[PDB]
Design a protein around this ligand. Structure first.
Ligand SMILES: Nc1ncnc2c1ncn2[C@@H]1O[C@H](CO)[C@@H](O)[C@H]1OP(=O)(O)O
Ligand SMILES: Nc1ncnc2c1ncn2[C@@H]1O[C@H](CO)[C@@H](O)[C@H]1OP(=O)(O)O
Ligand SMILES: [Mg+2]
Ligand SMILES: [Mg+2]
Lengths: 246, 246
């Protein structure tokens, strides 16, 4: 129980930032302002329909109250708890997301939700929240929720097989742009970003998430297979510190 | 000493994100890609020179190793320690910052560094680091370091009085865009962002900083006047949590 409190306390400052700061809101607006510009500029091959692919969690939907519950109950992430959160139907919208979504859908485009919320158990709550939140276009066929694989490239391909050309991707996780660094450590993930420097803010649109993600598992080999104590040490070992001298 | 460790442990996860994640790098590239587009589009009044205003800390310069030192030594922020860090000359560059800086300066623009690093004690180390890092245009006159006031609007005005029109602002803190929410709590700061939604990614360019900022003081009245214990409670009280029920 000591390790659990320590692990979740380490998330507090970043959670305050995501939940309370105007700075976070500004970053969300910045991403979606850029996304609209990219969508408007996009041209697709003859015969293709324009598609935008968007992740949900921490991209279009704000699940910060779940993180707040982890902090307050010293609870590390558990898929069983997550499913209850989804069923709770208290998701909020990331600033600018609804407007951008609805703009795309009313301007000769279609947003597809490629998300790792679970198709079997988490679909009903997701669709309910998004309708309440004001998203247009949330019929079941717009959703590619998780079934067998967490990697998303196969779903992107399903979308292209339906006659769409994907003009841009929106996400908070690099794995939202393809599979090339799925399950990889942060060194490789940073290298992927470097190799794609010019796409960010154009065809790859980023939202900030300092609370969780592929970068967490990226902190150390077999991070998620570690116990709570091992994860704390992984985080602290990853820290780069000034030695305090000149 | 117990409170000090707790306070700084709360920063760990967000520090891992800023230091290690490819996601953070992608956000930095996204901001600077957008900044170049805005700079290229900008037109100024007749007779004016084009200026870009940029903050340094966590906007163009990466001081994360200082934060890492705080974590490892259970040290809350202290201006005396900060000055030593600056003097240490180990600052790194935020991804994309040098290239954008040098592009502006070679394309009929001038970047001015409006920064709260201290003009008297922290200028020499700043200029030394920026030269090493590859920034062009780091003569003393490009810098508007802190003298008497932390609020930046007066410095922006000094720049305009020199015959420049400021075409865009780059920062990680909303106070980097003006004084309207300086010293204000987060509710007012979010409202400022909402009232300027369309400027973000255009004339106000944001970099992510989940480690510190005006949003921290924004968590509670007289936050920085609080003792370590009071600040921990301020952070935890600001948390919004799911109740765990449906
Ligand atoms: N703290 C956390 N750790 C892991 N996954 C989280 C999480 N918070 C929310 N999630 C979501 O829970 C599911 C399991 O990882 C994913 O859908 C993920 O969102 P994602 O779809 O955006 O990746
Ligand atoms: N953790 C922290 N808390 C307060 N200021 C910090 C800080 N880390 C770096 N700084 C910098 O230290 C000075 C005092 O606040 C400012 O120059 C600020 O950067 P800034 O100029 O970007 O605002
Ligand atoms: Mg996500
Ligand atoms: Mg700054």
């Amino acid at each position: 129980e000591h390790a659990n409190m320590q692990l979740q306390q380490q998330a507090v400052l970043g959670l305050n930032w995501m939940q309370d700061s105007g700075e976070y809101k500004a970053l969300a607006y910045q991403a979606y302002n850029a996304a609209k510009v990219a969508f408007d500029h996009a041209k697709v091959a003859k015969g293709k329909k324009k598609a935008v692919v968007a992740d949900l969690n921490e991209t279009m939907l704000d699940n910060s109250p779940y993180a707040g519950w982890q902090v307050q109950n010293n609870k590390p992430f558990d898929g069983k708890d997550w499913t209850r959160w989804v069923d709770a139907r208290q998701s909020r919208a990331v600033p600018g997301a609804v407007e951008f979504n609805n703009y795309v859908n009313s301007h000769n485009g279609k947003v597809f939700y490629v998300t790792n919320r679970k198709d079997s158990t988490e679909k009903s709550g997701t669709i309910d929240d998004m309708k309440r939140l004001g998203f247009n276009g949330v019929e079941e066929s717009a959703f590619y929720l998780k079934k067998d694989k967490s990697a998303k490239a196969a779903r992107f391909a399903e979308i292209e097989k339906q006659g769409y050309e994907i003009v841009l991707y929106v996400g908070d996780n690099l794995d939202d742009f393809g599979n090339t660094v799925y399950g990889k450590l942060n060194a490789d993930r940073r290298a992927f970003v470097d190799q794609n420097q010019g796409k960010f803010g154009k065809t790859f649109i980023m939202l900030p998430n300092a609370n969780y993600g592929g970068w967490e598992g990226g902190l150390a080999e077999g991070y998620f297979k570690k116990d709570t104590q091992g994860q704390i040490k992984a985080r602290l070992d990853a820290v780069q510190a000034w030695d305090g001298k000149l």
